């Protein structure tokens, strides 16, 4: 509809895949080369389906902060025959708040879904399904079941992936440039 949805659509069209684990289907953001991210509760194993293709997992790392607290981001390296467009220059360097964000989802259940979620708070600590979690972003949209992995963007920035909600609010794990230095 406008420049927020334009930037969101540009990321979805080139930098997402449908990830299937034994825990269900997730939006999965490709970041560079064969490296992608998914919520840690997807429980990535040795084999994953990527757009319904059986794919060996070369590495999978559940991120935690230096306090040894869950970040709810798993960085996955895929045995895929094709690289992602490198979008690391769209990642923020620091924890921050944002205006006018879009949550974008692409699954079997929710194809080509874009949600204007409005203002994003640097919320920090969240007890997420019983697990203490840091670097949480919050938006006042009633997200449901089927949004996990969904990409949170502003114009110019990819800021997080959707990991949960309480029925009134949705919560995203921050993406930071420092997660993907090589």
From Swiss-Prot:
Superkingdom classification of source: Viruses
Active site: 41 (for protease 3c activity), 72 (for protease 3c activity), 148 (for protease 3c activity)
All residue ranges annotated as the Peptidase C3 domain in the record: 2-180
Reactions performed catalytically: Selective cleavage of Gln-|-Gly bond in the poliovirus polyprotein. In other picornavirus reactions Glu may be substituted for Gln, and Ser or Thr for Gly
Biological role stated in the UniProt entry: Major viral protease that mediates proteolytic processing of the polyprotein. Cleaves host EIF5B, contributing to host translation shutoff. Also cleaves host PABPC1, contributing to host translation shutoff. Binds and inhibits host IFIH1/MDA5, thereby inhibiting the type-I IFN production and the establishment of the antiviral state. Cleaves host MAP3K7/TAK1, resulting in inhibition of TRAF6-triggered NF-kappa-B induction. Cleaves host TICAM1; this interaction allows the virus to disrupt host TLR3 signaling. Cleaves host IRF7, resulting in inhibition of type-I IFN production.
Subunit and interaction comment: Interacts with host IFIH1/MDA5; this interaction inhibits host IFIH1.
Name this polypeptide is given: Protease 3C
Organism lineage string: Viruses, Riboviria, Orthornavirae, Pisuviricota, Pisoniviricetes
Span of the entire protein shown here: 1549 to 1729 of 2188
């Amino acid at each position: 509809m406008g420049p927020g949805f334009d930037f969101a659509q540009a990321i979805m069209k080139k930098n997402t895949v449908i990830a299937r684990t034994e825990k269900g289907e997730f939006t999965m953001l490709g970041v560079y080369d064969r490296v992608a991210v998914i919520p840690t509760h997807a429980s990535v194993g040795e084999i994953i389906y990527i757009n319904d293709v059986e794919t060996r997992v070369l590495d999978a790392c559940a991120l935690r902060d230096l306090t040894d607290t869950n970040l709810e981001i798993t960085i996955v390296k895929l045995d895929r025959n094709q690289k992602f467009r490198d979008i690391r220059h769209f990642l923020p360097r620091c924890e921050d708040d944002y205006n006018d964000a879009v949550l974008s989802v692409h699954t079997s259940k929710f194809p080509n879904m874009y949600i204007p979620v409005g203002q994003v708070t640097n919320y920090g600590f969240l007890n997420l399904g019983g697990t203490p979690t840091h670097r949480i972003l919050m938006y006042n949209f009633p997200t449901r079941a089927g949004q996990c992995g969904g990409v949170v963007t502003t114009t110019g920035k990819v800021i997080g992936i959707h990991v949960g909600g309480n029925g009134a609010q949705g919560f995203a794990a921050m993406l930071l440039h420092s997660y993907f230095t090589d």
